[PDB]
Amino acid sequence: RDYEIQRERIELGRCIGEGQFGDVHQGIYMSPENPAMAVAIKTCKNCTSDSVREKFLQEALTMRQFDHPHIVKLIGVITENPVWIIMELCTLGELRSFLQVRKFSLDLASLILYAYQLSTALAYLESKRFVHRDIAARNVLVSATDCVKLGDFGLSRYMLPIKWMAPESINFRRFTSASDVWMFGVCMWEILMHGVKPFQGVKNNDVIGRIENGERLPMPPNCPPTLYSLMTKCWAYDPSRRPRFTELKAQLSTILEEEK
């Protein structure tokens, strides 16, 4: 694989957001005798700035090492100014908006499907000793009505997301697979709530107080008990009492099959 892509193969479409380094666009990758392929394009305004270009392109390098159906893929890079990273596009956009609009048209089976797919991605990351640290519905994208994906790891960063974070992450800056399991538990809660944020109206400071007192997000309406049980397990104060993503995958499979 040569990841460098000729600039003329890319047509820049609309801005669909932004990150630390600049704007994110949707567009198209064109190639001889092929259908145009829809893509996301990260831009770096004032790249080179040589140190800036380095950390920008490191975002591509992070994505490059991963190969999973439920994690967005790197297509390629343009390493001349202005520097761009070319990623797979998920055409239906962000999960939260998707869940809010399609609420009365989504069944419970689909919502569990999304948590299952994601857990397979996270079982994949854990087996590569990779720690995401920003698992949250805000960072999941919708590829098809029956397909969600973790988005770019670079664009996922920043909020300290106190409301999603494991206690040992907040208190002592420890970030492991176990703290990832905490955040996933929150992410499934968001999914079952159809994109409502955790701890609405609660100040960040109040949030750590509440979790130490043993308070947890409530069971969503129409969440099956076994699923909420699995969730609360993700929120064991003791990091080693939480299931691994391997276990989460296995249990969600059977819960999903049950609901179908």
Ligand X SMILES: CNC(=O)c1ccccc1Nc1ncnc(Nc2ccc(N3CCOCC3)cc2OC)n1
- Residues in binding site: 16-22, 42, 88-90
For Cα atoms 239, 243, 247, give the angle at the middle one, nearest 5 degrees. 155
Residue selected from 89, 187, 207, 248 as contacting ligand X according to rule CB under 6 A: 89
Closest approach of ligand X to the CB of residue 190, in Å: 14
Q: For residues 119 and 184, is the Cβ–Cβ distance under 8 A?
A: yes
Q: Does 86 bind ligand X (CB under 6 A)?
A: no
Closest approach of ligand X to the CB of residue 155, in Å: 4
Element (H, E) at 77: strand 74-78
Q: Closer to ligand X by CB, 42 or 194: give it.
A: 42
Torsion sign over Cα 49, 55, 56, 60:
positive
CA neighbours within 13 Å on the CB side: how many for 62? 20
The two tokens of residue 73 are 């893929």
Q: Closer to ligand X by CB, 23 or 247: give it.
A: 23
d(CA 227, CA 166): 19
For Cα atoms 64, 68, 71, give the angle at the middle one, nearest 5 degrees. 75
Total residues contacting ligand X (rule CB under 6 A)? Answer: 18
Residue selected from 156, 226, 246, 253 as contacting ligand X according to rule CB under 6 A: 156
Q: Closer to ligand X by CB, 149 or 242: give it.
A: 149
Count other Cβ atoms within 10 Å, centred on residue 145. 13
Count other Cβ atoms within 10 Å, centred on residue 2. 5
Residue selected from 152, 195, 231, 242 as contacting ligand X according to rule CB under 6 A: 152
Which of the residues 134, 152, 180, 206 is marked catalytic?
A: 134
Q: For residues 168 and 116, is the Cβ–Cβ distance under 8 A?
A: no
Q: Which of residues 18-57 bind ligand X (CB under 6 A)?
A: 24, 26, 40
Q: Closer to ligand X by CB, 155 or 231: give it.
A: 155
Binding residues for ATP: 16-22, 42, 88-90
Say whether 134 is catalytic: yes
Binding site for ligand X (CB under 6 A): 16-17, 24, 26, 40, 72, 87, 89-91, 93-94, 139, 141, 151-152, 155-156
Known catalytic residues?
Answer: 134
